[PDB]
Amino acid sequence: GFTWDALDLGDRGVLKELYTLLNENYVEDDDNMFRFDYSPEFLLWALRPPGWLPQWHCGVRVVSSRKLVGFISAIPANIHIYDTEKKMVEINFLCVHKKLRSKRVAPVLIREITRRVHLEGIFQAVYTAGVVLPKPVGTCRYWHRSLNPRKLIEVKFSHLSRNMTMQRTMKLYRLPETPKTAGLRPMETKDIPVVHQLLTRYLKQFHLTPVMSQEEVEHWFYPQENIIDTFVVENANGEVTDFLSFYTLPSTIMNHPTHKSLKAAYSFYNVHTQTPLLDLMSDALVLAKMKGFDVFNALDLMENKTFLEKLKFGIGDGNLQYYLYNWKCPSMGAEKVGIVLQ
């Protein structure tokens, strides 16, 4: 029969077949043809934060042996909803093999990690999903800004309006070869606590935010070449600053001429002191582009809805929604959502 359990993370041989799963499984595509291709390392950046536990990377193999067919993460967090900071967890990566003809899988594959967590007291859960669910807390929507238009037009991810030449479109979505912000410089190792304290007071204005430690803001922020970026803005002789961050997350491709995948550039967080971030967000586009990216995808967060539309952002394939498992409380607009849980 089946009432299985497992584990997965760290080891090369394992981890690989693991992303193999999500590679051609964890989909959220539509008419077109493409799902989130997951990087070997990236996973570790997300699946291994400070305080993670082995029994939360559940696995599932076919009655046989050499057959992984299911997964689900659950990285430890410390949400902030009501007038309180409830230590909760962020559940993610819930997949099920493709050809699997069993609907009595996830319904157990789900309640399993629920028990596994309810053992450390973390009875509260946090996550988002490319689907609908009864009691939602939020409902954001993705945007863009082609850093390689002729490509999207070439494939089928994006297209030119009515009579828009495959040339003017470019001119429009053009970009300078050098930032228009003086001080923009990659975050050093010693810039960690400066990104912790600077982000804890800032983020400290949203109804739902991920409180982090000097080590956490040290994990989802310190630069890594093919995972996540973060350029701080040091001042003159001092240190005072603001900064931007965008975790790479390329999506697999499909039927195309001879084009490569799709180097994605989703946005993580962005904290400008007082100075308007309408440029802190633009530079990002100049970075993601100068770094060889095809698009900068930014969701909602208060101050996002601002610079968004007043900048080359529009198309919205769909919309991501936020939820809370065992907590009851009122809802808010995108302007209040802080947690950028992938």
Side-chain angles (χ1 to χ4, degrees), residues 1-7 10-15 17-28 32 34 36-59 62-79 81-85 87 89-97 100 102 104-111 113-115 117-134 136-141 143-153 155-173 175-179 181-200 202-203 205-214 216-238 240-255 257-258 260-262 264-273 275-301 303-304 306-320 322-327 329-331 333-334 336-342:
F2 238 43
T3 312
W4 278 61
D5 314 289
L7 167 78
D11 179 2
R12 292 273 71 275
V14 168
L15 207 300
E17 67 178 61
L18 181 56
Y19 88 74
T20 295
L21 181 53
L22 298 308
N23 179 299
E24 240 64 296
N25 272 64
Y26 213 72
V27 182
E28 42 63 60
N32 40 70
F34 48 60
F36 290 10
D37 174 291
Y38 278 79
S39 178
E41 151 56 10
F42 196 68
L43 288 168
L44 294 84
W45 172 71
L47 295 176
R48 295 203 167 191
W52 73 278
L53 300 182
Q55 75 308 300
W56 284 343
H57 299 27
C58 288
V62 175
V63 175
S64 303
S65 298
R66 182 66 169 179
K67 297 183 179 183
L68 174 67
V69 316
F71 183 73
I72 175 62
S73 178
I75 52 183
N78 297 293
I79 62 180
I81 20 61
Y82 207 67
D83 292 299
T84 183
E85 179 236 62
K87 185 176 184 64
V89 59
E90 308 178 3
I91 315 306
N92 251 171
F93 301 107
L94 168 42
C95 173
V96 168
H97 177 53
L100 277 175
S102 53
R104 310 310 301 131
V105 158
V108 181
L109 195 284
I110 294 176
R111 55 162 193 165
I113 172 55
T114 311
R115 299 174 186 175
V117 185
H118 281 48
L119 269 58
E120 184 183 356
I122 303 186
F123 289 59
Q124 319 301 315
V126 182
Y127 65 108
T128 73
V131 280
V132 178
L133 235 72
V137 182
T139 293
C140 313
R141 301 182 83 282
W143 301 67
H144 298 279
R145 193 294 140 74
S146 302
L147 300 170
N148 195 308
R150 184 161 60 65
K151 191 178 181 181
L152 317 181
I153 298 178
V155 61
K156 300 293 181 175
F157 167 52
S158 180
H159 313 294
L160 37 62
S161 184
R162 262 58 301 209
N163 188 60
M164 256 286 257
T165 64
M166 298 165 265
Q167 311 312 307
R168 284 215 296 299
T169 298
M170 267 70 111
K171 295 187 65 183
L172 196 183
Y173 300 89
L175 282 182
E177 307 84 52
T178 311
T181 177
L184 192 299
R185 171 209 54 182
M187 178 181 115
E188 294 200 65
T189 310
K190 304 68 73 63
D191 289 307
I192 301 174
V194 191
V195 176
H196 164 56
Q197 61 193 63
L198 191 77
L199 168 69
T200 39
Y202 171 100
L203 191 61
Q205 66 184 55
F206 306 114
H207 299 60
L208 176 56
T209 66
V211 166
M212 298 184 270
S213 60
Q214 184 192 300
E216 291 177 53
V217 183
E218 181 174 0
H219 182 41
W220 318 95
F221 300 79
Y222 191 98
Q224 305 170 294
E225 239 320 56
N226 291 296
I227 319 170
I228 63 173
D229 291 281
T230 296
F231 292 64
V232 79
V233 173
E234 189 254 6
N235 58 295
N237 184 66
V240 182
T241 178
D242 331 300
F243 54 89
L244 63 297
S245 174
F246 51 82
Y247 61 79
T248 295
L249 209 182
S251 295
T252 312
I253 32 179
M254 253 307 108
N255 301 303
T258 53
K260 58 285 191 175
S261 179
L262 192 181
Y266 296 59
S267 75
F268 198 49
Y269 292 56
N270 294 300
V271 174
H272 55 304
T273 47
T275 66
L277 73 176
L278 172 50
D279 54 296
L280 191 165
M281 284 310 312
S282 175
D283 289 294
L285 308 169
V286 176
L287 273 291
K289 173 57 181 176
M290 73 70 134
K291 277 184 176 297
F293 274 157
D294 301 346
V295 70
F296 189 78
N297 306 174
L299 288 55
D300 266 316
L301 182 160
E303 350 296 313
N304 286 50
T306 299
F307 71 87
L308 288 176
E309 308 197 62
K310 54 197 301 178
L311 189 42
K312 305 68 185 179
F313 289 65
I315 297 176
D317 296 306
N319 49 304
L320 184 58
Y322 289 57
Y323 307 81
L324 288 166
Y325 190 56
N326 294 175
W327 185 283
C329 57
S331 56
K336 305 78 172 302
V337 181
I339 295 182
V340 189
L341 205 175
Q342 284 73 184

